[PDB]
Design a protein around this ligand. Structure first.
Ligand SMILES: [Fe+3]
Length: 54
């Protein structure tokens, strides 16, 4: 499971951690996060995130 970055503020979604306080449990791949979820830090939608490839 890849990490994704919010391209607006730099927040990194790490699938190991999830975003549990917004209902996204540890182990949830980015593509399975409900599509109305927004960046916890800046509030933009999923469409401004990009996969972290390295
Ligand atoms: Fe953000």
């Amino acid at each position: 499971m890849k990490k994704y970055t919010c391209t607006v503020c730099g927040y990194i979604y790490d699938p190991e951690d999830g975003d549990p306080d917004d209902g996204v449990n540890p182990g949830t791949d980015f593509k399975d996060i409900p599509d109305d979820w927004v960046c916890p830090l800046c509030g933009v939608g999923k469409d401004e995130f990009e996969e972290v490839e390295e």
